[PDB]
Amino acid sequence: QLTM
Amino acid sequence: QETTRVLTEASINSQIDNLRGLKENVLIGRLIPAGTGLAVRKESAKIEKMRE
Amino acid sequence: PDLRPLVPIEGGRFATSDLNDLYRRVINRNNRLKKLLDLNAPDIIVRNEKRMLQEAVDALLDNGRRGRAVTGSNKRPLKSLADMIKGKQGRFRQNLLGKRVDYSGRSVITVGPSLRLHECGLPKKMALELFKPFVYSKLRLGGHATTIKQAKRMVELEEAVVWDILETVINEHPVLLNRAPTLHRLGIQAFEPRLIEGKAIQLHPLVCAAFNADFDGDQMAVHVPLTVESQLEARVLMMSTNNILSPASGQPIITPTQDIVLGLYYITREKEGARGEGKLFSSYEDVSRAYNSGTIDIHAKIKLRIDRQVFDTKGNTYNEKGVVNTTVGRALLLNILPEGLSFSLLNKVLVKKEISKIINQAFRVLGGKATVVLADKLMYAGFKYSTLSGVSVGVDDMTIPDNKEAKIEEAEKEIKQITEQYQSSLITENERYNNIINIWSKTSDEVGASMMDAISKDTVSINGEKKEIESFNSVYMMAKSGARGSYNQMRQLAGMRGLMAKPDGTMIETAITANFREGLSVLQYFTSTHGARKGLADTALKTANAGYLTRRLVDVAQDLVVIEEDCGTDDGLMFSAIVEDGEVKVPLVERALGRTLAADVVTEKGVVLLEAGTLLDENLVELLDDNGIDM
Amino acid sequence: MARVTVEDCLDKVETRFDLVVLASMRANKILKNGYSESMENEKKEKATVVALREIAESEITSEQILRNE
Amino acid sequence: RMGHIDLVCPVVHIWYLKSLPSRIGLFLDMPLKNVEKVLYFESYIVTD
Amino acid sequence: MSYSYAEKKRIRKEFGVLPHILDVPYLLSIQTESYKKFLTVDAAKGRLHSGLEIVLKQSFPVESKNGQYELHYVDYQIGEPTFDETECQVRGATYDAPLNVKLRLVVYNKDALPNEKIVEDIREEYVYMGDIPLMTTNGTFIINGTERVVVSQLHRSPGAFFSKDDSEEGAFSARIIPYRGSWLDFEFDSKGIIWARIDRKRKFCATVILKALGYTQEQILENRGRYISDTLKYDLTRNTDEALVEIYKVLRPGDPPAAASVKALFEGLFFIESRYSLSDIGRMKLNARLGSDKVSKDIYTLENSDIVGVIEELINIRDGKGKVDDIDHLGNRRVRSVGEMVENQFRIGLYRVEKGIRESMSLVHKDKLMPKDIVNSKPITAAIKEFFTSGALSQFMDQDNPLSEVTHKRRISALGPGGLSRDRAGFEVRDVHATHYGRLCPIETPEGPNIGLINSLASYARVNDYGFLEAPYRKVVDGKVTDEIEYLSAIDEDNYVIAQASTKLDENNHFVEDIIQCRSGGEAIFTESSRVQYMDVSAKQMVSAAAALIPFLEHDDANRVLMGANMQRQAVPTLKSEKPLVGTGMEKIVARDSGNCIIARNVGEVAEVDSNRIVIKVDTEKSQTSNLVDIYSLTKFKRSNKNTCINQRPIVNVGDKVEAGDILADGFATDFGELSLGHNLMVAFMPWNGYNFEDSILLSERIVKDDKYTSIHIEEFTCVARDTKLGPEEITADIPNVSESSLAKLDESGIVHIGANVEAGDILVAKITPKAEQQLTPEERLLRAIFNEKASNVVDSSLRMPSGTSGTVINVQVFENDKGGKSKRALKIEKELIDKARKDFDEEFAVIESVVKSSIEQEVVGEKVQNAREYYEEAKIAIDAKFEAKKKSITQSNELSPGVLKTVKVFVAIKKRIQPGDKMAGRHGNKGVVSRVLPVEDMPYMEDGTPVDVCLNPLGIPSRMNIGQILEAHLGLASYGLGKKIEKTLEKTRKAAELRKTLEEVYNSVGDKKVNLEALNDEEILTLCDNLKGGVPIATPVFDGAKEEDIKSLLKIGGFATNGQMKLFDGRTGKPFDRHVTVGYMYMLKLDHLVDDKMHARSTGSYSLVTQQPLGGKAQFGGQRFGEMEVWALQAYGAAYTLREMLTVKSDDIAGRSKMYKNIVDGKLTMNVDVPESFNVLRNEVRALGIDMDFDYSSE
RNA sequence: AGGAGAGGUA
DNA sequence: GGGTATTCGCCGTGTACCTCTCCT
DNA sequence: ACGGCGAATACCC
Ligand SMILES: [Mg+2]
C-alpha cells in the first residue's frame, strides 16, 4: 500500500 | 540465505546448535517453544511435583 | 542410491539424475588416471589428467563456482550437490518449511449470506473425500460393514446411509480455510462446516476483509485438523469468532462493508415533511406493526418511549428512560441492540464510522459473543433494507454542473493570454508551464466543487417550501455512506478528469476537460493510458519488494516470545505527541494507551496521579489529558 | 460455536493456552474410557466439546482435579 | 547406506577454497590468485 | 442497408457520424504475407527472388579442394504434401512439402590448375533437400497433429545507436548492431579518453582498433581536440600486428600469438559475410545516421570508414553537435515475422549441409559420381523441425472461440530468442510510448509479469518491407483534407502535425475550428488548424481488434477496458449462438477474417444442402471458367485446442441466389456471420439479499432451463499397444478376471461402441501385456487355497475413463501394426473401412458430375465438344487420388511409435450447464461468480409479469468508472422495446404492407443512416420481421457511437421512460420497491473457469520418491502446499499441535502416516513424530559433501 | 516419476 | 607506511493454483 | 538488470  | 557461506564456517568452527528456537524446531518436527508448546511444559511441571 | 533415483520412463527409457552424470564423470577420470599412473606415462599428460580429475570433483560439489557451465544433454547446466540444499528451490525452502499435506482440498468461494459468523459451506463431494477414514470407522462401528473393504466399497457407490453418517461426523469438527498470500494471521481461520450441494465454498460476508477476498474468482484451501489437541486448538484459538479485532491495531475486522452499510445508512436518514410525522409509539412492536401496513414512511420523525439499562465507563449501570425524538428507521433497529448499550448509538445516521463505533462499544462493554451476535443482526438488517429500497444507479445520477462550460471557457481564455505573453518573449518556462498547469489544476477543482453542489443538494417548494434539502441521489448516497466511492472517483464521472501524467512524472499541458459521462475523445483517451499502464506495472513489480521485506522481518524477529510476567526493570522511553513542528498530528493519548508506566506521573503542582507499573487503559488516559500532562 | 463459549471458560482458566492443554487432557481421559462403539453413535456429542463444557460449568472437573496422576 | 570412491590423487574441497574468504588461502597467507595456480597445475611451490 | 445475403435476414441499425474512408485490412495478413515471401515469387510487388532461393543462391558453390568438382545451384521446386491439413491432425503428421533443388556438377582433366573443372562430368539433376512445413490457409501450422502459431517478434533494428547512460557526465556510448555478428561498441569518460570493446571483452583503448590503417601521423590528419591525443599518447602499440596480438589477448584467454591465426580473426570478425552481416537495414540506417553514402547500398559488412565516422560522431555528440537515440522509439525497433525466422534456420542448416558435402566430396571414391550421394538433407529437416517443435515463439494455438485465434495471430512479443527476459526488463520497455499510436494497441497486454511485453497489433497497422510498423493518414494539402491515404512510419511522422478523425469539417473539407488538439511530435498539443498536415482515416485506428468489440469504450476506464478485452478471449461458445443486440459493427469482420464461416467463391445458386456439404451451381456467365460446380464440405463436432467444440451449420436454402463473398455457413461461435460469445440477459441493477454482495451474480433458473449457457466439451483419450520385452502387448478383449457385467459395452474386439454412455471408471479399450513371477506373500498363501486361484501370464494395460467424468462416445479411431499382416479381424476392419470410405468418395463424386451433366444437358437441349468433353476424365483422377490414400497408410498412417503396435483414440462428449461457482463476465470489465440460481417466482418482475434474468450490484459501477456498462443496459432496453413493437404488429394483421410500415418507424426515425427497406420484397420483409422479435440489433462504433439524445429517442419510441428505470415488484410478496430500478439488456459471457475442473479434495494418495511427501497438482491426486507464509500464521496463533502434525504425520513422517490412518479407522489415540523423512534426506546430502552433521546428547 | 519452455487465474 | 579510490565478484529479488507439448 | 556489500589493488598523503 506504500511505495511513493 | 547464503547457505554455503554459513555451512563452511559452521563446519570449521565445529559449531553446536541448541535447538531452542521457532524455526529450528520446525525443521526437525517437534513443538515450537511458544503458545501451547510452552504451556504443555508448564502444566506438566505441575504433575511430577504432585506425584511427589 | 534411492536419493538419486533411476525411475523408468514411457517407452523404454530412463529419466536419470544429474548426480549420476557427475558421479560417472568422476569415476571415469579416476580409473583413467590410475592406469595411466601404472604405466609410468609421461608427466606432461599425467598432469593434464590430474587437472581434469580435480575439475570433475569441483563440478560434482558445485558447478559454476570456478568452471563455466558444465552442461548436460539439453544445453542446461547440471545440478550439483550444493544446489539441492540452497536457494528458493532447495531443501530448506520448498521441503522443510514447505510440505504439501494430506486431508486437504480446494475450490472456488461463493457468498452464502445466511450463515452465522462461525460457519462455512462445504460441498458434499469435497467433504466426503476429506473425511473418508472417519466415515470408514463410523460405518464399521454402527453395523453397516464388517471389514473395511465393504465400507470402502459402499463409500464409492455413494449409498444413502453414507450421507447422514457424513453429517454426523463433520458435526462439531472444525476446518481451517486459507487464501492465496497469507499476509497475516487472519488469513487462516477455523469454521464449522455444513454440507451444501454444489461445488463451491460459501464464505460468510463479514470474514472477507480479513482474508482480503471477493467473489470474482478467488479460491481457498481446506485443511482438516486430525487430533484432539489440534481440534481444540482450532476452536479455542483460530475459530473466526475470536478474531474480532486486528492484531496490528485495536480496530475491528468484522465491520459491515459495502451494501450492509448502504441499507443501514438509508433507513436511518430522515425526511422533514413525511407521512406519519409526529406519531407516538411505545415499543419496537408498535413501529414494526405500523410500518408493515404501508401507512407510515421509513424516514418520518416520530417519538418513542424507551426504558433500558446502560453500562458506562466505570462499569456502573444507570437507567435510560423517557420519550426521545427518533426516525421510523432508527427505531426499527432498536430490536437488535443488546442490553448494556444506549439508544444514542443508533439514534444517528449510521455512516461506516459509526457502525464500527457500535461494534467497538459492544466489544469493550459487553464482550465477545454479544458482539458477534450484534454484527450478524446488523448484517441481516442491512442486506434486507438495501433490497426493499430498490437502490440502483442510472446515468442521470451523474449530474454535470451547469457552470462547467463557462468555467472551462474562461480557463481557455486565460491559457490563450499566457501564450500571448510567451510569444513576445516575456517568460520562458512559466509562460508554457507551471502557469498553464496551475490554471488547469485550479479549474479542475472549481468544477469538482460545482459538481457536489449538484449531487448533494436537492429542491422542494411544495408549501412555499422552496429551499435546499439533502439529496437522496444514489451516487451521492454511496459515497457519503462511506460504502464505496471517493470524491475524485466521483469527480471523474461527472466533473472533468483534469491533468494526466507522462510516466516520468511531468504533467501533460493539455487537460482532459471531459468526464466519463459525455465520453473522452481518442486523443484524450490516449494520454490517460500512460498513467494506467504505469500504475498496473508498479502494482506487480512491487509485491516482490514487500514480500522480501516481510521475509527478512520474520527472520530477524522470529524467536521473540513473551516468557515471563515481569523482569523488574524500571527504564523505558519518553513518549510525547509526535508533532510535525507545526501541529499535533497524533495525541499523547492513543500513544500511551496499553503501555505501562516506568516512572510516576507527578503533576505540575506536585501531587501524583498514577504510580509506576499501572497498565494504562481507556479509563486512565483521560487523567493524562485532563491534568495537562505531556510526557 | 452453538452452546459452548470460550468466554465461559476464560473465567476459570488462564492464557487461552492453558485452556487447550487442560481440555485436551480431559478429552483424552474421556475417550480412553469408551464413550462410543456400543449404543450411542447419533446420541452423544464430541469429547472435545464435552470436555470444554465441564470447565465452563464448574462441572465434573476443575483445573486442579483435571490431573488424575 | 552409502559407499565411497577411493581417489588416487588428493583434490581440494571447492568450498574451502572459493567461499570468500578462503579458509585455505588464509591458513597459509597466500592470495587465492596464487593458490589457484598451484592447484590447477600452472606453477610450483617449494614445500621445503 | 440490407445489401448482402445474411446481412438482410436481420439488419442492424448503425449509429455514428464519421464517414467511411478505408475498410479494415485483412486481419491475418501479417502471418500470411510473410510465409509467402519465403516460398513464392511476385513481380507485381517487385519480389523477383523468393527468399527460400536467396538463401541457396548465396551459399552453394562448394569446390571442395582442387578436385575437379564444383556444384552450382540451378533451380528448385516445392513438392506436394502427402496429406491435407484435415488429415494430418487426424493421423498425427505434420503438414509439410518436400523441397527439391537442381544441382549441376563440373570437372576437367585434373591438370596443373589449367581449368581443373571445365571439361567433362557436367551432370545435373533434381535432388531432395528437405521438408518445409506449409502454413495453412489461415496462418497456423500443423506440427505433429497440433495447430500452432509462430508469434511475431519486436527486436532492435541494426545500425549505430548513440546511448548516454546518464550516471556521470561526459559518458557517451556508440554501438554498432549487426543483424548477425559481433557487437562493436565504444565509449567515453569524464576524463575524455575514447575506449573500445568487442562482444563482451574487457575495455581496451580505442586507437587499438584504429590500427586497420595504423599510421599515427595519418590519424590526426583525418581527425579538433585533445581526445584522441589523450589516446594517441595512450597507445603503446606502434606496428599493426602488435596491436593485433594485443586485441587477440582479449579474444582468447591463455592463447599464444600466431602470425596467420591472429590476423585471420580480426579480418574475419566484421568483414566475412558468412560470419557477419548488417543485412540491408544496417547499411541504410548507418548511411542515414552517419549521413553519408560513401558505402554502397549492398555492402552488408563493416567498411573501414564506418568506424572512423562512428568515432567522429561519438566525439561530436559528446561536444554538443548532435542528439542521442531513443531506445523505445518504434523507429528503432523492427518486426521479424515467421518467414524471416524460418529463413534464418534454413541458412543455419544449409551451412552445415554445404560444409559436409565438400568434406565427403573427396572421401567418396567410385565411378559416375551423381550429385545425390554427396549432399545430405538431415541437417535441414532437423533444424526446421527444431524451430517448430521446441522454439519459444512457436506456440500452441489459443482456440476457445474465433477471437482467441484472430488475436493470437496478431500478437507481437518482445521476448524470445534475440529479445528480453520477463525479469531483466523493467519499467520502460513496459511503457506506452508516443509512437505506439496507430501501431500497437495501448490497452491490450497481460495482467501478470508480461505486462508491456506482449503488445498486440492495432487495427489498420502494416509491417512494411523493412519491418517497421506503419499506419494510414489522409493528406491535408492546401488546408483542405483530401482523400489520398498514405502510410507513415514512426520516423516519418515525427515531423508532421496529425489531427484526429473526429475533428469538425465543413462541406468543403476545411476545418471549422481555429485551435484543435493535434499531435505535433507524437506529443499532444493545442495548435492552430493551419498547421495540420495529416488526419486519421478512422477512430478505431488506435485500438486493437478485440478492444473494438466493446461498445461505449470512451465511457470506460482504461484499467477496465484492458480486462474487458482480455476476458472475451476466454468465453466458452454456447449450444445455440446468439448475436449481441448492442454491438460495434466488428463481429462480422472478426468472424469473416477468420476461417470459420464458409464463404462462396463464385456467383451461383444453391443446388443441394444438408448438414455435411453444400453444392453450388456456378453461374458461369458472370464468373470465371470455374468447374461449373462448387462443393463445400462442413465441419461437424470437431475437438478444439481447449477441448471445446467446433461445428458448422448451413444458412442457405435450396434455390438461393448467392454471390461472391456471401456467407453460406456459420461456424465456431457465429450467428449469420457475426461473432456470438454469449447471450442477452434482462439485468436489474439492484442488491438482492447479499447474493450479489462483493461481485457475486444472481441468476434466474429460467436461464438454465432455456439452456442459455450450455456448451459441448469433447475429450480425447488414447491407448497404445506396445511391443514390450517380456511379451507383446495385445488389444484383445480377454481381460483376465474382469467382471463379466463390465464386458457388455465392449464389442467383440475390446473397444467400446460408438454411441454408448460411459461413466467414470469403465473400460474404453482393453489391452493386455504379459506378467509373470507373482510370489505373493504368505498372507495370500494361507487364504489362496480356499478358492484355488489361477495363474496369469498376462496383465491388463486396459484404458479406463478418469474420475468424475462421463459422456457418450462419438468417435473411435484405430491405427494397427505397421507392416504386418493383420488377422481375420484387423485387416477385415481396415478393408471394410476402405470399402466404406471409397464408397462415400464415390457418392461425393457421382453427384459432382451428375450436376455437371445436368448443366451440360441444359444449354444444348433447349459442337458439344468444348466444355462437355473435359469434366468426366477430371473427377476420375480425384476418386483415384483420394481412394488409395484413404488406405495408403503405413498400416498406422505413420511409423506407429517403434516399440508400439496399435494406437487407438476415443472421443467423449458431454454437455455442461451453468451452476453456482462458474465465472461470468460482460464486455466492460466486470466479472463475477454465480452464487445462486433463484426460482423464477422469486425474481423481481416488471408490471406486466416479465421476470428478470440477473441482478447485479450497483455499488461496483461508480468506484470502477466503467459507465458504458450502464449505457449498454439503457440501449438494450431501447432495443427490447423496439422489438416488441414489431411482435405486437405481427400477431395482428401479418400483411407485408403493414410490416413495411412499422419497420420504418423502428429503423428510420432516430439517426441519419436510413436502412432503406425499399429494396426487400415482401417475402424478405416477412423473414426480417420474424427475426427482429427478440430485439432490433443496434451498432455503435467504438469512438463514434450513439449519443444520449439518441438512446432517449429510442426509449421513447419503445414506450419507456427517458431513463433506464422502471418499477419492479418483489417476487416474494408482490409489493413494489421504492426507488425505480435500472433494467436493461446487457450482453453477458461465460468464461472457461468452470468450478467443475477446480474442486479437488484428497485424503491420502501416493507420495514422491526422494522426499516422500505427497504429490501435487490434482492430475495425479494433488495435495495442497502448506507454504511458509502459512506457517508464520500458525506460529502467530501459538498453534503448536496443529503445526507439528501438518509437518510430520500429514506429509512425510513415513512411520507416522500409516499409524495415523490405522488409528483413525479404529478409533484410537497415539502419536510419535519421529523425524520428517525430508530432514534425513538433507543431512544425508550434506554429508555427501565433506561435512558431518549429526544428532547428539548434551551432557555438558 | 522429474525437469524445461509457453500460456493463464487470484 | 598509511588511506583512500576505484575495480571486480557474490548474493539477492512474493504466494498458491491450472493447462499444453517436449525430453528423459 | 539492479542494488548493496565486501576483498583487492593502485595512486596519492
Ligand atoms: Mg478476488
Q: How far apart are CA F965 and CA F954, in angstroms?
A: 11
Host H or E run for residue F517: strand F515-519
F695 CA distance to ligand 1 middle (Å): 9
Angstrom distances, CA of residue F230 to CA of C494, F235, F573: 65, 9, 72
The class (CATH top level) of C403-533 is mainly alpha
CA distance B46 to chain D (A): 9
Task: Name all contacts of C158-167 with Cβ < 8 Å and 24+ positions apart.
Answer: C158/C128, C162/C128, C162/C135, C163/C124, C163/C195, C165/C135, C165/C138, C165/C139, C166/C124, C166/C127, C166/C128, C166/C131, C166/C135, C166/C195, C167/C195
- Strand C119-123 relative to strand C201-203, pairing: antiparallel
Please name the residue ranges forming H helices in C241-338: 260-267, 284-291, 328-331
Mutate which of B30, B41, B42, B43 to test chain F, going by most F C-beta atoms within 10 A? Answer: B30
CA distance C59 to C18: 11
What three-state secondary structure class fits F1180?
helix
The answer to whether the CB of F184 falls within 8 A of the CB of F206 is no
Give F623's contacts (C-beta < 8 A, 6+ positions apart).
F602, F603, F604, F660
* Burial degree of C499 (CB within 10 A; 0-12, 13-18, 19+): middle
Classify residue C92 by its DSSP letter.
I
CB contact under 8 A, D20 and C229: yes
Q: How far apart are the first and last CA of chain C?
A: 69
Q: What is the dihedral of CA F803, F804, F809, F814, to 10 degrees?
A: -20
CA of F480 to C1' of H21 (A): 57
3-class secondary-structure state, position C286: helix
Question: Under a CB-based contact definition with an 8 Å cutoff, are residues F381 and F98 in contact?
Answer: no
**Which of the nucleotides lies closest to F421 (Cα–C1')?**
I1
How many Å lie between the centroid of ligand 1 and the Cα of residue F692? Answer: 14
Please give the protein residue whose CA is closest to the C1' of the nucleotide H10.
E20
The sheet with strand F598-599 has its strands ordered as F598-599, F663-666, F649-650
Q: Is C351 exposed, middle or buried (0-12, 13-18, 19+ CB in 10 A)?
A: middle
* C-alpha distance from residue F952 to each of C475, F583, F650, F914, F949 (Å): 16, 21, 37, 17, 10
Mention every residue, 6+ apart, whose C-beta is less than 8 A from residue C238: C176, C188, C189, C190, F1133, F1135, F1138
Helix axes C132-141, C148-156, angle to 10 degrees: 120
3-state DSSP helix/strand/coil % of chain F, to nearest 5: 25, 20, 55
Write out chain C residues lying below 8 Å of D23, CB-based. Answer: 232, 236
Work out the end-to-end distance of chain D between its first and last CA atoms, rounded to an integer number of angstroms. 31
- DSSP character string of C142-194: TTS-SSHHHHHHHHHTT-SSHHHHHHHHTTT--EEEE-SS--SGGGEEEEEEE
User: Which chain D residues touch C367 with a CB distance below 8 Å?
Assistant: 7
Q: In a 10 Å sphere around its CB, with 0-12 CB exposed, 13-18 middle and 19+ buried, how is residue F567 labelled?
A: buried
Contacts of C37-42 spanning 24+ positions with Cβ under 8 A: C37/E8
**What is residue B1's DSSP assignment?**
-
Instruction: List chains touching F (3+ CB pairs under 8 A).
Output: B, C, D, E
Least Cα distance to C215 among C99, C360, C112 occurs for C112
3-state secondary structure of F808: strand
Of F1126, B18, F1085, whose CA–CA distance to C211 is shortest?
F1126
| E13 closest CB neighbour out of F1180, F1184, F1186 | F1186
Instruction: For residue B26, give the nearest of F1127, F1133, F1188 by CB distance.
Output: F1127
Q: From ligand 1's centre to the CA of C219, what distance in Å?
A: 8
Of the candidates F1104, F976, F1121, which has an alpha carbon nearest to the alpha carbon of residue F1047? F976
From C85, C90, C561, residue closest to B34, measured CB to CB: C561
CA separation for the pair F492, F246 (Å, rounded): 44
Q: Give the CA-to-C1' distance from F1125 to H14 in angstroms.
A: 10
Handedness of CA F1147, F1153, F1156, F1160 (dihedral sign): positive
**What's the number of domains chain D is made of?**
1
Q: Which among F1083, F699, F731 has a CA at the least distance from the CA of F906?
A: F731
Backbone phi and psi for residue C27, each to the nearest 5 degrees, phi listed first: -65, -35
Check: CB of residue C382 under 8 Å from CB of residue F687.
Answer: no
Residues of F in contact with B35 (CB under 8 A): 1131, 1133-1136
The shortest CB-CB distance from E41 to any of C26, C33, C50 is to C50
The alpha carbon of residue F1137 is apart from the nearest alpha carbon of chain D, in Å, by 10
Distances, alpha carbon F239 to alpha carbons F212, F264, F914, in Å: 10, 17, 82
Distance in angstroms (rounded) separating the CA atoms of residues A3 and F536: 39
Question: Strand C188-196 to strand F184-187: parallel, antiparallel, or no bridges (unpaired)?
Answer: unpaired
Identity of the amino acid at B12:
I
Residues of E within 8 A of B4 (CB-CB) are 15, 19
Give residue D26's domain range.
1-69
Nearest to residue F1083, comparing CAs of F571, F518, F418? Answer: F571
Structure determination technique employed = cryo-EM
Measured CA to CA, the distance from residue F489 to residue F495 in angstroms comes to 11
- Tell how far the Cα of C213 is from the centroid of ligand 1, in angstroms: 5
How many Cβ atoms sit within 10 Å of the Cβ of residue F259?
9
CA distances from F163 to C136, C292, D66, F116, F760 (A): 73, 77, 79, 54, 64
Closest C1' nucleotide to F1126's CA: H15
CA of C185 to the centre of ligand 1 (A): 19
Asked if F585 and F1009 touch (Cβ cutoff 8 Å), the reply is no
Q: Which residues of chain C lie closer than 8 angstroms to A3, CB-CB?
A: 538, 542, 545
Half-sphere exposure of C132 toward its Cβ, with a 13 Å CA cutoff? Answer: 23
Q: Which three cell numbers stand for residue F85?
A: 491439413
Report d(CA F747, CA F675) in Å as an integer. Answer: 42
Chains that touch B (3 or more CB pairs under 8 A): C, D, E, F
* Rounded-to-integer distance, Cα E22 and Cα E16, Å: 6
For chain A, helix, strand, coil in percent to 5 are 0, 0, 100
Closest C1' nucleotide to E31's CA: I8
| Residue from the list C33, C50, C65 with its beta carbon closest to the beta carbon of E18 | C65
F566 CB inside 7 Å of strand G: yes
- F696: distance to nearest CA of chain D, Å? 27
F945 touches chain C (CB under 8 A): no
Q: Please, what is the Cα angle at F305 between F303 and F311, to 5 degrees?
A: 125
**Within 7 Å: CB of C74 and strand H?**
yes
- The crossing angle, in degrees rounded to 10, of helices F1044-1054 and F964-986 is 30
Using an 8 Å Cβ cutoff, are F687 and F953 in contact?
yes
User: Which residues share a beta bridge with F187?
Assistant: F173, F195
In angstroms, what CA-CA distances link D46 with B44, C171, C190, D22? 25, 9, 17, 16
Contact predicate C602/C626, CB 8 Å: no
End-to-end distance of chain B based on CA atoms, in angstroms? Answer: 48
Of C85, C96, C555, Cβ closest to residue B27: C96
Tell the burial category of F748 from Cβ atoms under 10 Å away from its Cβ (0-12, 13-18, 19+).
exposed
- Among left, alpha and beta (phi > 0; psi -120 to 50; other), residue F145 is left
In this structure, chain E runs to a length of 48
SS3 label, residue F269 = coil
Dmax over Cα atoms in chain D, in whole Å? 38
Question: How many C-beta atoms lie closer than 10 Å to residue F20's C-beta?
Answer: 7
E32 strand I contact, CB < 7 Å: yes
C560 touches chain B (CB under 8 A): no
Determine the 3-state secondary structure of F87 from DSSP: helix
F253 near E CB under 8 A = no
* Cα–Cα distance for residue pair D36/D44, rounded to 1 Å: 9
Round and report the angstrom distance from CA (E20) to C1' (H9).
10
Which resolution in angstroms does this entry have? 3.0
- With 0-12 / 13-18 / 19 or more C-beta atoms within 10 angstroms meaning exposed / middle / buried, residue C432 is middle
Q: What is the dihedral of CA F1053, F1057, F1063, F1064, to 10 degrees?
A: 50
CA distance C298 to C267: 6
Q: Return the beta strands (E) in C402-544 as ranges.
A: none
Q: How many CB atoms lie within 10 A of CB F788?
A: 6
Positions of strand H less than 7 angstroms from a protein CB: 8-24
Which cell is C450 given? 460545482
Distance C217 CA to ligand 1 centre (A): 6
User: What torsion, rounded to 10 degrees, do the Cα atoms F531, F537, F540, F541 define?
Assistant: -70
Interface of B with C in 6-35 (CB under 8 A): 20-23, 26-27, 33-35
Residues in chain F: 1196
What's the farthest any 2 CA atoms get from each other in chain E? Answer: 42
CA atoms within 13 A of residue C434's CA, in its CB half-sphere: 5
- Three-state DSSP state, F527: strand
Q: Residue C527, exposed/middle/buried by CB under 10 A (0-12, 13-18, 19+)?
A: buried
Can you tell me the distance from the alpha carbon of F1137 to that of F1169, in angstroms, rounded to the nearest whole number?
11
Question: CB-based contact (8 Å) between B34 and chain D?
Answer: no
Distances, alpha carbon C187 to alpha carbons C109, C117, C179, C180, C182, in Å: 14, 15, 6, 9, 5
Which chain B residues touch D21 with a CB distance below 8 Å?
36, 39-40, 43
> Per-residue DSSP letters for C491-512?
HHHHT--B--B-TTSPBPSS-B
| Through-space separation of residue B24 CA and nucleotide I8 C1' in angstroms | 37
Q: CA of D45, closest CA in chain B: separation in Å?
A: 25
What b/e readout covers F693-729, taking b as 16+ CB neighbours within 10 angstroms?
Answer: bbbbbbbbebbeeeebbbbbbbeebebbbbbbeeeeb
The DSSP secondary structure of F633-652, one letter per residue, reads E---SEE-TTS-EE--EE--
Q: Is E31 on the interface with F (CB under 8 A)?
A: no
Answer whether C259 sits within 8 Å of F1111, measured CB to CB.
Answer: no
| Residue partners of C289: CB distance under 8 A and separation at least 6 | none
Provide the 3-class DSSP secondary structure of residue F381.
Answer: helix
Q: Do chains D and E touch (3 or more CB pairs under 8 A)?
A: no
C495 CB-side CA count, 13 A = 24
Is the C-beta atom of F1118 closer than 7 angstroms to strand H? yes
Q: Do B21 and C85 touch (CB under 8 A)?
A: no
Q: C-alpha grid cell for residue C138? A: 463410523
Closest nucleotide to E34: CA versus each C1': I8
Q: CA C107, CA C118: separation in Å to the nearest integer?
A: 19
F412-413 and F152-156 beta bridge pairing: parallel
**What cell was used for C53?**
580429475
Taking contacts as CB-CB distances below 8 angstroms, the residues of chain F near D21 are none
CA C56/CA F902 separation, integer angstroms = 45
Measure the CA–CA gap between F442 and F457, rounded to whole angstroms. 9
